[PDB]
Design an enzyme around this catalytic site. Structure first.
Site, PDB file in Angstrom:
ATOM      1  N   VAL A 102     128.941   4.422   2.896  1.00 20.39           N
ATOM      2  CA  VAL A 102     128.410   5.620   3.589  1.00 20.39           C
ATOM      3  C   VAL A 102     128.151   6.677   2.517  1.00 20.39           C
ATOM      4  CG1 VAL A 102     128.843   7.367   5.354  1.00 20.39           C
ATOM      5  CG2 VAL A 102     129.651   5.033   5.702  1.00 20.39           C
ATOM      6  N   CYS A 103     127.072   7.421   2.689  1.00 18.49           N
ATOM      7  CA  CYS A 103     126.760   8.601   1.883  1.00 18.49           C
ATOM      8  C   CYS A 103     126.718   8.180   0.412  1.00 18.49           C
ATOM      9  CB  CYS A 103     127.759   9.689   2.236  1.00 18.49           C
ATOM     10  SG  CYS A 103     127.221  11.328   1.690  1.00 18.49           S
ATOM     11  N   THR A 104     127.285   8.978  -0.483  1.00 18.42           N
ATOM     12  CA  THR A 104     127.225   8.684  -1.930  1.00 18.42           C
ATOM     13  C   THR A 104     128.150   7.523  -2.314  1.00 18.42           C
ATOM     14  OG1 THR A 104     128.660  10.562  -2.257  1.00 18.42           O
ATOM     15  CG2 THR A 104     126.257  10.879  -2.630  1.00 18.42           C
ATOM     16  N   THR A 122     121.342   6.464   0.871  1.00 17.79           N
ATOM     17  CA  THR A 122     122.459   7.361   0.514  1.00 17.79           C
ATOM     18  C   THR A 122     122.150   8.729   1.123  1.00 17.79           C
ATOM     19  OG1 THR A 122     123.955   7.969  -1.258  1.00 17.79           O
ATOM     20  CG2 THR A 122     121.606   8.130  -1.758  1.00 17.79           C
ATOM     21  N   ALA A 152     123.324   6.664   5.340  1.00 19.76           N
ATOM     22  CA  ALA A 152     122.869   7.901   4.703  1.00 19.76           C
ATOM     23  C   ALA A 152     124.019   8.911   4.680  1.00 19.76           C
ATOM     24  CB  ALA A 152     121.623   8.374   5.428  1.00 19.76           C
TER      25      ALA A 152
END
Lengths: 229, 227
Positions: A102-104, A122, A152
Protein backbone atom coordinates in the site's frame (compact mmCIF):
# COMPACT_ATOMS: atom_id res chain seq x y z
CA UNK A 1 -6.51 -22.84 13.43
CA UNK A 2 -3.34 -24.71 12.25
CA UNK A 3 -4.68 -24.41 8.58
CA UNK A 4 -5.14 -20.57 8.75
CA UNK A 5 -4.15 -18.34 5.78
CA UNK A 6 -0.92 -16.62 7.03
CA UNK A 7 -0.97 -12.83 6.37
CA UNK A 8 2.06 -10.73 7.32
CA UNK A 9 2.46 -6.92 7.49
CA UNK A 10 5.90 -5.35 7.87
CA UNK A 11 5.67 -2.96 10.85
CA UNK A 12 8.51 -0.39 10.92
CA UNK A 13 9.33 2.85 12.73
CA UNK A 14 7.52 5.91 11.20
CA UNK A 15 5.01 3.72 9.32
CA UNK A 16 1.80 5.48 8.16
CA UNK A 17 -0.46 3.47 10.46
CA UNK A 18 -3.69 3.58 8.34
CA UNK A 19 -1.77 1.83 5.50
CA UNK A 20 -1.54 -1.18 7.90
CA UNK A 21 -4.63 -0.82 10.15
CA UNK A 22 -7.15 -0.35 7.31
CA UNK A 23 -6.20 -3.58 5.54
CA UNK A 24 -5.73 -5.38 8.89
CA UNK A 25 -9.36 -4.87 9.98
CA UNK A 26 -10.62 -5.94 6.51
CA UNK A 27 -8.48 -9.11 6.29
CA UNK A 28 -8.94 -10.08 9.99
CA UNK A 29 -12.75 -10.25 9.16
CA UNK A 30 -12.12 -13.28 6.85
CA UNK A 31 -12.49 -16.95 7.89
CA UNK A 32 -9.52 -18.64 9.73
CA UNK A 33 -6.81 -15.99 8.99
CA UNK A 34 -3.74 -15.43 11.20
CA UNK A 35 -2.24 -11.92 10.88
CA UNK A 36 1.39 -11.24 11.87
CA UNK A 37 3.00 -7.82 12.45
CA UNK A 38 6.67 -8.34 11.61
CA UNK A 39 9.79 -6.42 12.58
CA UNK A 40 13.39 -7.15 13.67
CA UNK A 41 12.10 -8.01 17.20
CA UNK A 42 8.63 -8.28 18.76
CA UNK A 43 7.63 -5.17 20.75
CA UNK A 44 6.42 -1.59 20.38
CA UNK A 45 6.86 0.30 17.10
CA UNK A 46 5.81 4.00 16.90
CA UNK A 47 3.92 5.15 13.78
CA UNK A 48 4.50 8.60 12.20
CA UNK A 49 1.42 10.00 14.09
CA UNK A 50 2.71 8.75 17.50
CA UNK A 51 0.23 5.83 17.60
CA UNK A 52 2.06 2.84 19.19
CA UNK A 53 1.65 -0.56 17.49
CA UNK A 54 3.08 -3.93 18.62
CA UNK A 55 5.11 -6.32 16.40
CA UNK A 56 4.03 -9.96 17.11
CA UNK A 57 7.06 -11.70 15.48
CA UNK A 58 10.71 -11.30 14.40
CA UNK A 59 11.94 -11.86 10.82
CA UNK A 60 13.62 -15.10 12.10
CA UNK A 61 10.45 -16.60 13.73
CA UNK A 62 7.92 -15.49 11.09
CA UNK A 63 6.28 -18.57 9.48
CA UNK A 64 6.12 -18.85 5.65
CA UNK A 65 3.45 -16.33 4.55
CA UNK A 66 0.56 -16.74 2.09
CA UNK A 67 0.38 -12.91 1.84
CA UNK A 68 3.13 -10.36 2.56
CA UNK A 69 2.04 -6.70 2.68
CA UNK A 70 4.38 -3.67 2.93
CA UNK A 71 2.77 -0.44 4.17
CA UNK A 72 4.22 3.02 3.45
CA UNK A 73 5.16 6.10 5.45
CA UNK A 74 8.04 8.44 6.32
CA UNK A 75 9.97 5.30 7.42
CA UNK A 76 10.16 3.76 3.87
CA UNK A 77 13.39 5.66 2.96
CA UNK A 78 15.33 3.73 5.67
CA UNK A 79 13.75 0.37 4.63
CA UNK A 80 14.80 0.88 0.95
CA UNK A 81 18.47 0.55 2.12
CA UNK A 82 17.97 -2.03 4.96
CA UNK A 83 19.57 -5.29 3.71
CA UNK A 84 17.95 -7.32 6.53
CA UNK A 85 14.39 -6.13 5.68
CA UNK A 86 14.97 -6.52 1.88
CA UNK A 87 16.35 -10.09 2.38
CA UNK A 88 13.24 -11.02 4.44
CA UNK A 89 10.89 -9.58 1.75
CA UNK A 90 12.68 -11.47 -1.09
CA UNK A 91 12.65 -14.75 0.93
CA UNK A 92 8.93 -14.52 1.70
CA UNK A 93 8.01 -13.32 -1.85
CA UNK A 94 9.67 -16.50 -3.33
CA UNK A 95 6.71 -18.68 -2.12
CA UNK A 96 3.89 -16.25 -1.16
CA UNK A 97 0.50 -16.59 -2.93
CA UNK A 98 0.35 -12.73 -3.12
CA UNK A 99 3.12 -10.11 -2.76
CA UNK A 100 1.46 -6.85 -1.82
CA UNK A 101 1.89 -3.22 -0.73
CA UNK A 102 0.00 0.00 0.00
CA UNK A 103 1.12 3.57 -0.70
CA UNK A 104 4.94 4.05 -0.69
CA UNK A 105 5.32 0.39 0.43
CA UNK A 106 5.69 -0.34 -3.33
CA UNK A 107 9.01 1.63 -3.31
CA UNK A 108 10.26 -1.02 -0.79
CA UNK A 109 9.13 -3.84 -3.15
CA UNK A 110 10.98 -1.85 -5.87
CA UNK A 111 14.20 -1.66 -3.80
CA UNK A 112 13.91 -5.47 -3.22
CA UNK A 113 13.89 -5.98 -7.05
CA UNK A 114 10.26 -7.24 -7.15
CA UNK A 115 8.80 -4.56 -9.52
CA UNK A 116 11.18 -5.18 -12.49
CA UNK A 117 8.95 -5.23 -15.62
CA UNK A 118 5.77 -5.30 -13.42
CA UNK A 119 2.68 -3.04 -13.38
CA UNK A 120 2.59 -1.08 -10.10
CA UNK A 121 1.03 1.93 -8.38
CA UNK A 122 1.91 4.03 -5.30
CA UNK A 123 0.95 7.35 -3.64
CA UNK A 124 0.20 9.98 -6.35
CA UNK A 125 3.01 12.33 -5.09
CA UNK A 126 5.76 9.62 -5.39
CA UNK A 127 4.54 7.86 -8.61
CA UNK A 128 7.61 9.15 -10.65
CA UNK A 129 9.94 6.97 -8.46
CA UNK A 130 8.40 3.67 -9.78
CA UNK A 131 10.08 3.77 -13.26
CA UNK A 132 13.71 3.92 -11.94
CA UNK A 133 12.97 0.70 -9.94
CA UNK A 134 11.94 -1.05 -13.21
CA UNK A 135 8.16 -0.76 -12.76
CA UNK A 136 5.53 0.02 -15.41
CA UNK A 137 3.83 2.93 -13.57
CA UNK A 138 -0.03 2.68 -13.66
CA UNK A 139 -2.30 5.58 -12.48
CA UNK A 140 -4.95 3.23 -11.03
CA UNK A 141 -5.87 2.85 -7.35
CA UNK A 142 -5.37 -0.98 -7.14
CA UNK A 143 -3.03 -2.59 -9.72
CA UNK A 144 -2.66 -6.36 -10.30
CA UNK A 145 0.19 -7.98 -12.21
CA UNK A 146 0.03 -11.78 -11.67
CA UNK A 147 0.44 -12.35 -7.90
CA UNK A 148 1.61 -8.70 -7.28
CA UNK A 149 -1.09 -6.31 -6.00
CA UNK A 150 -0.24 -2.68 -5.16
CA UNK A 151 -2.50 0.03 -3.73
CA UNK A 152 -2.20 3.79 -4.24
CA UNK A 153 -1.94 6.36 -1.43
CA UNK A 154 -2.91 5.68 2.22
CA UNK A 155 -6.73 5.14 2.11
CA UNK A 156 -6.37 2.96 -1.03
CA UNK A 157 -5.47 0.21 1.46
CA UNK A 158 -9.25 -0.39 2.06
CA UNK A 159 -9.98 -0.83 -1.70
CA UNK A 160 -6.83 -2.97 -2.01
CA UNK A 161 -7.84 -5.23 0.90
CA UNK A 162 -11.37 -5.90 -0.46
CA UNK A 163 -9.78 -6.73 -3.89
CA UNK A 164 -7.38 -9.16 -2.16
CA UNK A 165 -10.25 -10.68 -0.11
CA UNK A 166 -12.09 -11.61 -3.37
CA UNK A 167 -8.89 -13.32 -4.69
CA UNK A 168 -8.23 -15.28 -1.41
CA UNK A 169 -11.91 -16.32 -1.02
CA UNK A 170 -14.57 -15.15 -3.53
CA UNK A 171 -16.66 -12.08 -4.52
CA UNK A 172 -19.52 -13.13 -2.14
CA UNK A 173 -17.14 -13.17 0.89
CA UNK A 174 -15.56 -9.77 -0.06
CA UNK A 175 -19.06 -8.24 -0.52
CA UNK A 176 -20.19 -9.55 2.93
CA UNK A 177 -17.13 -7.89 4.54
CA UNK A 178 -17.80 -4.66 2.56
CA UNK A 179 -21.36 -4.63 3.98
CA UNK A 180 -20.17 -5.42 7.56
CA UNK A 181 -17.74 -2.41 7.14
CA UNK A 182 -20.63 -0.26 5.79
CA UNK A 183 -18.08 0.77 3.10
CA UNK A 184 -20.32 3.02 0.95
CA UNK A 185 -18.05 6.10 1.10
CA UNK A 186 -19.53 9.65 0.81
CA UNK A 187 -16.54 12.02 1.15
CA UNK A 188 -17.56 15.59 2.18
CA UNK A 189 -15.12 17.07 -0.41
CA UNK A 190 -13.81 15.96 -3.86
CA UNK A 191 -10.07 16.64 -3.16
CA UNK A 192 -8.84 13.00 -2.95
CA UNK A 193 -6.99 13.11 -6.33
CA UNK A 194 -4.64 15.75 -7.80
CA UNK A 195 -6.99 15.68 -10.87
CA UNK A 196 -10.10 16.76 -8.78
CA UNK A 197 -8.67 18.83 -5.86
CA UNK A 198 -8.59 22.64 -6.21
CA UNK A 199 -5.34 23.64 -8.07
CA UNK A 200 -4.32 25.73 -5.01
CA UNK A 201 -4.49 22.57 -2.83
CA UNK A 202 -2.44 20.40 -5.28
CA UNK A 203 0.20 23.24 -5.37
CA UNK A 204 0.52 23.62 -1.53
CA UNK A 205 0.99 19.77 -1.29
CA UNK A 206 3.68 19.56 -4.06
CA UNK A 207 5.38 22.53 -2.22
CA UNK A 208 5.29 20.54 1.11
CA UNK A 209 6.46 17.18 -0.42
CA UNK A 210 9.31 18.64 -2.59
CA UNK A 211 12.11 18.10 0.04
CA UNK A 212 10.96 14.47 0.72
CA UNK A 213 10.75 13.80 -3.06
CA UNK A 214 14.36 15.01 -3.75
CA UNK A 215 15.65 12.93 -0.76
CA UNK A 216 13.71 9.81 -1.91
CA UNK A 217 14.91 10.28 -5.53
CA UNK A 218 18.56 9.93 -4.33
CA UNK A 219 17.71 6.87 -2.16
CA UNK A 220 15.74 5.39 -5.13
CA UNK A 221 18.74 5.74 -7.56
CA UNK A 222 21.11 4.21 -4.92
CA UNK A 223 18.67 1.27 -4.56
CA UNK A 224 18.40 0.94 -8.40
CA UNK A 225 22.26 0.82 -8.69
CA UNK A 226 22.37 -2.13 -6.19
CA UNK A 227 19.91 -4.10 -8.41
CA UNK A 228 22.13 -3.29 -11.46
CA UNK A 229 25.43 -4.55 -9.82
CA UNK B 1 -4.51 26.42 22.75
CA UNK B 2 -3.72 23.13 20.94
CA UNK B 3 -7.07 21.42 20.08
CA UNK B 4 -7.37 18.43 22.51
CA UNK B 5 -8.96 15.37 20.80
CA UNK B 6 -9.72 12.26 22.87
CA UNK B 7 -10.75 8.77 21.71
CA UNK B 8 -12.09 6.24 24.20
CA UNK B 9 -9.97 3.06 23.71
CA UNK B 10 -11.69 0.03 25.30
CA UNK B 11 -11.22 -3.74 25.19
CA UNK B 12 -12.75 -5.34 22.03
CA UNK B 13 -12.92 -1.99 20.18
CA UNK B 14 -13.35 -2.22 16.37
CA UNK B 15 -9.92 -0.68 15.76
CA UNK B 16 -10.63 0.92 12.34
CA UNK B 17 -13.40 3.03 14.01
CA UNK B 18 -10.51 4.70 15.97
CA UNK B 19 -7.46 4.37 13.71
CA UNK B 20 -9.18 5.84 10.57
CA UNK B 21 -10.23 9.08 12.33
CA UNK B 22 -6.92 9.16 14.29
CA UNK B 23 -4.74 9.34 11.17
CA UNK B 24 -7.04 12.03 9.61
CA UNK B 25 -7.16 14.24 12.76
CA UNK B 26 -3.49 13.75 13.86
CA UNK B 27 -2.60 15.24 10.34
CA UNK B 28 -4.04 18.69 11.40
CA UNK B 29 -2.04 21.63 12.78
CA UNK B 30 -2.18 22.46 16.53
CA UNK B 31 -3.84 19.22 17.77
CA UNK B 32 -2.97 16.71 20.53
CA UNK B 33 -4.67 13.29 20.29
CA UNK B 34 -5.23 11.15 23.42
CA UNK B 35 -6.20 7.46 23.67
CA UNK B 36 -8.13 7.20 26.92
CA UNK B 37 -8.88 4.22 29.15
CA UNK B 38 -9.11 3.47 32.89
CA UNK B 39 -5.27 3.21 32.92
CA UNK B 40 -2.54 3.77 30.31
CA UNK B 41 -1.14 0.66 28.65
CA UNK B 42 -2.14 -2.08 26.25
CA UNK B 43 -5.78 -2.52 25.13
CA UNK B 44 -6.57 -5.37 22.70
CA UNK B 45 -8.97 -4.72 19.80
CA UNK B 46 -11.57 -7.28 18.63
CA UNK B 47 -9.16 -8.44 15.85
CA UNK B 48 -6.29 -9.08 18.32
CA UNK B 49 -4.46 -5.87 17.26
CA UNK B 50 -2.83 -4.36 20.38
CA UNK B 51 -3.23 -0.58 20.88
CA UNK B 52 -1.84 1.57 23.70
CA UNK B 53 -3.91 3.93 25.89
CA UNK B 54 -1.88 7.13 26.51
CA UNK B 55 -3.85 8.45 29.56
CA UNK B 56 -6.16 7.41 32.40
CA UNK B 57 -9.54 9.13 32.88
CA UNK B 58 -7.92 11.25 35.69
CA UNK B 59 -4.91 12.50 33.66
CA UNK B 60 -7.02 13.28 30.53
CA UNK B 61 -6.95 17.04 29.82
CA UNK B 62 -10.23 18.86 29.20
CA UNK B 63 -11.21 17.81 25.66
CA UNK B 64 -12.25 19.98 22.70
CA UNK B 65 -13.47 16.76 20.98
CA UNK B 66 -14.49 13.43 22.57
CA UNK B 67 -14.94 10.49 20.14
CA UNK B 68 -16.41 7.09 21.06
CA UNK B 69 -15.61 4.26 18.60
CA UNK B 70 -17.69 1.08 18.37
CA UNK B 71 -17.07 -2.64 18.42
CA UNK B 72 -17.93 -5.86 20.27
CA UNK B 73 -16.83 -4.10 23.50
CA UNK B 74 -19.64 -1.44 23.54
CA UNK B 75 -22.09 -3.83 25.29
CA UNK B 76 -19.91 -3.79 28.43
CA UNK B 77 -19.47 0.04 28.26
CA UNK B 78 -23.28 0.58 28.03
CA UNK B 79 -23.53 -0.76 31.68
CA UNK B 80 -20.20 0.60 33.01
CA UNK B 81 -21.06 3.51 35.34
CA UNK B 82 -17.41 4.75 35.47
CA UNK B 83 -17.10 4.99 31.65
CA UNK B 84 -20.57 6.64 31.31
CA UNK B 85 -19.76 9.15 34.12
CA UNK B 86 -16.38 9.95 32.44
CA UNK B 87 -18.15 10.52 29.06
CA UNK B 88 -20.78 12.81 30.72
CA UNK B 89 -17.91 14.74 32.54
CA UNK B 90 -16.11 15.48 29.20
CA UNK B 91 -19.36 16.00 27.19
CA UNK B 92 -20.26 18.85 29.66
CA UNK B 93 -17.61 21.34 28.32
CA UNK B 94 -16.43 19.51 25.12
CA UNK B 95 -16.84 21.68 21.97
CA UNK B 96 -17.90 18.44 20.12
CA UNK B 97 -19.33 15.13 21.44
CA UNK B 98 -18.85 12.45 18.77
CA UNK B 99 -18.96 8.76 17.89
CA UNK B 100 -18.43 6.30 15.01
CA UNK B 101 -20.53 3.16 14.34
CA UNK B 102 -21.92 1.53 17.53
CA UNK B 103 -20.09 4.18 19.62
CA UNK B 104 -23.38 6.14 19.40
CA UNK B 105 -25.04 3.36 21.52
CA UNK B 106 -22.58 4.29 24.33
CA UNK B 107 -23.52 8.01 23.95
CA UNK B 108 -27.15 6.79 24.13
CA UNK B 109 -26.56 4.78 27.33
CA UNK B 110 -24.94 7.95 28.83
CA UNK B 111 -28.19 9.90 28.09
CA UNK B 112 -26.54 12.15 25.46
CA UNK B 113 -28.82 11.25 22.46
CA UNK B 114 -32.14 12.28 24.16
CA UNK B 115 -34.12 14.21 21.50
CA UNK B 116 -31.13 14.39 19.08
CA UNK B 117 -30.74 13.27 15.43
CA UNK B 118 -28.19 10.40 15.27
CA UNK B 119 -27.02 7.41 13.24
CA UNK B 120 -25.12 4.16 13.84
CA UNK B 121 -24.16 0.95 12.00
CA UNK B 122 -26.99 -0.15 9.66
CA UNK B 123 -27.41 -3.54 11.44
CA UNK B 124 -27.98 -1.92 14.90
CA UNK B 125 -29.95 1.19 13.79
CA UNK B 126 -33.18 -0.03 15.54
CA UNK B 127 -31.41 0.46 18.95
CA UNK B 128 -31.21 4.31 18.65
CA UNK B 129 -34.94 5.01 19.27
CA UNK B 130 -35.09 3.24 22.70
CA UNK B 131 -32.11 5.42 23.80
CA UNK B 132 -34.09 8.58 22.94
CA UNK B 133 -32.55 9.47 19.54
CA UNK B 134 -34.39 10.57 16.39
CA UNK B 135 -32.85 7.90 14.08
CA UNK B 136 -31.56 9.30 10.74
CA UNK B 137 -30.34 7.04 7.88
CA UNK B 138 -27.43 9.26 6.82
CA UNK B 139 -23.71 8.44 6.98
CA UNK B 140 -22.71 11.52 9.05
CA UNK B 141 -25.38 13.25 11.18
CA UNK B 142 -24.87 16.62 12.92
CA UNK B 143 -27.22 17.92 15.66
CA UNK B 144 -25.70 21.03 17.26
CA UNK B 145 -22.34 19.94 18.68
CA UNK B 146 -23.16 16.18 18.35
CA UNK B 147 -21.74 14.42 15.23
CA UNK B 148 -22.36 10.67 14.73
CA UNK B 149 -20.98 8.51 11.93
CA UNK B 150 -22.52 5.30 10.59
CA UNK B 151 -20.82 1.89 10.40
CA UNK B 152 -17.02 1.32 10.69
CA UNK B 153 -15.54 3.00 7.55
CA UNK B 154 -17.88 6.02 7.94
CA UNK B 155 -15.26 7.17 10.49
CA UNK B 156 -13.13 8.53 7.58
CA UNK B 157 -16.06 10.65 6.17
CA UNK B 158 -16.92 11.70 9.75
CA UNK B 159 -13.32 12.82 10.49
CA UNK B 160 -13.01 14.95 7.32
CA UNK B 161 -16.42 16.53 8.21
CA UNK B 162 -15.08 17.29 11.72
CA UNK B 163 -11.75 18.62 10.34
CA UNK B 164 -13.61 21.27 8.26
CA UNK B 165 -15.62 22.35 11.40
CA UNK B 166 -12.45 22.64 13.63
CA UNK B 167 -10.46 24.47 10.88
CA UNK B 168 -11.94 25.13 7.38
CA UNK B 169 -12.67 23.45 3.99
CA UNK B 170 -9.16 24.11 2.55
CA UNK B 171 -7.50 22.37 5.57
CA UNK B 172 -9.84 19.35 5.21
CA UNK B 173 -9.12 19.23 1.41
CA UNK B 174 -5.29 19.27 2.03
CA UNK B 175 -5.66 16.24 4.37
CA UNK B 176 -8.04 14.45 1.92
CA UNK B 177 -5.40 14.84 -0.87
CA UNK B 178 -2.50 13.66 1.40
CA UNK B 179 -4.65 10.56 2.27
CA UNK B 180 -5.47 10.08 -1.50
CA UNK B 181 -9.09 9.59 -0.30
CA UNK B 182 -10.78 9.13 -3.71
CA UNK B 183 -12.38 5.75 -2.98
CA UNK B 184 -13.02 3.21 -5.78
CA UNK B 185 -14.58 0.20 -3.99
CA UNK B 186 -14.31 -3.02 -6.09
CA UNK B 187 -17.97 -3.89 -5.28
CA UNK B 188 -21.22 -1.94 -4.61
CA UNK B 189 -22.14 -3.88 -1.42
CA UNK B 190 -21.45 -1.20 1.24
CA UNK B 191 -25.15 -0.53 2.05
CA UNK B 192 -28.14 -2.87 2.54
CA UNK B 193 -29.84 -0.70 -0.17
CA UNK B 194 -27.24 -1.69 -2.89
CA UNK B 195 -25.80 -5.09 -1.79
CA UNK B 196 -27.15 -8.30 -3.37
CA UNK B 197 -30.05 -9.81 -1.36
CA UNK B 198 -27.93 -12.98 -0.65
CA UNK B 199 -25.15 -10.81 0.89
CA UNK B 200 -27.63 -8.86 3.05
CA UNK B 201 -29.22 -12.15 4.28
CA UNK B 202 -25.78 -13.54 5.33
CA UNK B 203 -24.64 -10.24 7.01
CA UNK B 204 -27.97 -10.09 8.99
CA UNK B 205 -27.55 -13.82 9.91
CA UNK B 206 -23.99 -13.18 11.26
CA UNK B 207 -25.17 -10.11 13.30
CA UNK B 208 -28.31 -11.74 14.82
CA UNK B 209 -26.83 -13.06 18.12
CA UNK B 210 -24.99 -9.74 18.75
CA UNK B 211 -28.20 -7.75 17.95
CA UNK B 212 -30.32 -9.86 20.39
CA UNK B 213 -27.72 -9.44 23.22
CA UNK B 214 -27.60 -5.65 22.48
CA UNK B 215 -31.46 -5.37 22.39
CA UNK B 216 -31.36 -6.67 26.03
CA UNK B 217 -28.54 -4.31 27.18
CA UNK B 218 -30.21 -1.33 25.43
CA UNK B 219 -33.55 -1.81 27.24
CA UNK B 220 -31.73 -2.07 30.65
CA UNK B 221 -29.73 1.12 29.85
CA UNK B 222 -32.97 2.94 28.75
CA UNK B 223 -34.79 1.83 31.95
CA UNK B 224 -31.94 3.33 34.08
CA UNK B 225 -32.26 6.72 32.25
CA UNK B 226 -36.09 6.66 32.87
CA UNK B 227 -35.87 5.77 36.64
Amino acid sequence: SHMAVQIGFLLFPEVQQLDLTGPHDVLASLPDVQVHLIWKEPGPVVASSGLVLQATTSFADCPPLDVICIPGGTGVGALMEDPQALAFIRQQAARARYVTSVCTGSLVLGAAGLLQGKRATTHWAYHELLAPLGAIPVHERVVRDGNLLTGAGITAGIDFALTLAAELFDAATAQRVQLQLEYAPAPPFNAGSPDTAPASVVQQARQRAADSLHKRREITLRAAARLAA
